[PDB]
Amino acid sequence: HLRTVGTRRQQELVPLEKSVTHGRGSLLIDMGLFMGRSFRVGWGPNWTLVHNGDKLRLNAEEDQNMDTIDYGFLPKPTSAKSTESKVHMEK
């Protein structure tokens, strides 16, 4: 029940988040033509929103790979990462 309440809170936050995104589109909308000098916009938030949707309260929260994977090696190691590459070519 507590988890459901938190999702209800989480859901409310998402609605608030959706409203914020809408405001950004509304405030940040840019319409220059035919060709106009590029201007700053919250292009990134939309990209992150899709990722958040894919991840999707409690479930989504404790369902997002903190990285999130560990590789175990025999003789001897392997690589791993998550992540700046997720394999290293070690010389």
């Binding site: 990722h51 990285d67 560990d70 090696f73 025999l74 791993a80 998550s82």
Partner: protein, 291 residues
């Protein structure tokens, strides 16, 4: 918060949840939040795609290769409540079996050590674990444990095959009740041999270190509290699991894995960084390096 973390991490390129190397180090199965189970091949260090096994209604979580003694088998679980087993027959990467016996998401899978047969253990987010045992043909009989963990299960890890030289297998798993339950199986049914409460929040991952022939069996665990514990058993047959703190980060630890020979812990979590740890000659754990 989480939103702030997301803002900090834009993501240079698409992301994947788990990805495990094959036995013999030939293939490299992966899965991501797009519902796609990609099998790559790594001959000479170069990654080459072989197949995109699509078939899950939700994001795939963890993935595990079966032992090559049973041919070439790979199993993946998902947020769709289903688990898929893909066989291979001449490049014929078809699914020979599918299991949908849990009502909520399936956080993790793992294969029993190859001697016990072809047993696959699976922990759901309903709080139940379903284990699939292979018979002669395409039948798979399920041994289900209902209400294993209170609000759901995240990790499942098999105890190393230990010859009684009449065979006893022990499995310990973590979940979102904070408890790292170990499991004992007799004729068929599995009972909780013990509970392990040292985490102050949701157990993320739980890895049973391979025994180097050594009888001092260890298990590692990581949780939302940001602590890593290396629980130890001092001797065979004494129900004493004494936890010892490896480290605490201010952020969550997602995954933990044991390196085969030296028992090096790969701690994945916190700040998008992964650390490597070796127990010193003094019994304190230390960070070898930053990856």
């Amino acid at each position: 918060m989480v939103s702030v973390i997301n803002t900090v991490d834009t993501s240079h390129e698409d992301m994947i949840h788990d990805a495990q190397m094959d036995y013999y180090g030939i293939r490299l199965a992966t899965c991501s939040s797009d519902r796609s189970v990609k099998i790559f091949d790594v001959k000479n260090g170069g990654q080459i795609l072989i197949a995109d096994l699509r078939g899950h209604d939700g994001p795939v979580w963890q993935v595990a290769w079966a032992h090559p003694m049973y041919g070439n088998i790979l199993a993946s679980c998902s947020y769709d409540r289903k688990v898929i087993i893909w066989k291979e027959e001449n490049g014929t990467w078809e699914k020979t079996y599918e299991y949908t016996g849990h009502d909520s998401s399936v956080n993790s899978v793992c294969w029993a050590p190859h001697d016990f047969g072809l047993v696959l253990a699976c922990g759901s987010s309903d709080g139940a674990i379903s284990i699939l045992t292979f018979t002669g043909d395409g039948p798979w009989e399920v041994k289900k444990i209902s209400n294993a963990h209170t609000i759901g299960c995240n990790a499942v890890s098999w105890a190393p095959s230990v010859i009684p030289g009449n065979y006893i297998k022990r499995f310990v798993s973590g979940g979102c009740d904070n408890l790292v339950k170990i499991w004992r199986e007799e004729d068929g049914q599995w009972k909780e041999d013990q509970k392990l409460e040292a985490h102050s929040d949701w157990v993320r991952d739980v890895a049973w270190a391979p025994s180097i022939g050594l009888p001092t069996s260890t298990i590692a665990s990581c949780s939302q509290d940001g602590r890593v514990y290396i629980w130890t058993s001092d001797d065979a047959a004494t129900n004493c699991w004494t936890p010892k703190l490896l480290h605490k980060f201010n952020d969550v630890v997602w995954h933990v894995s044991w390196s085969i020979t030296a028992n090096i812990l790969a701690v994945s979590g916190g700040d998008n960084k992964v650390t490597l740890w070796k127990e010193s000659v003094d019994g304190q754990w230390a960070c070898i390096s930053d990856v």
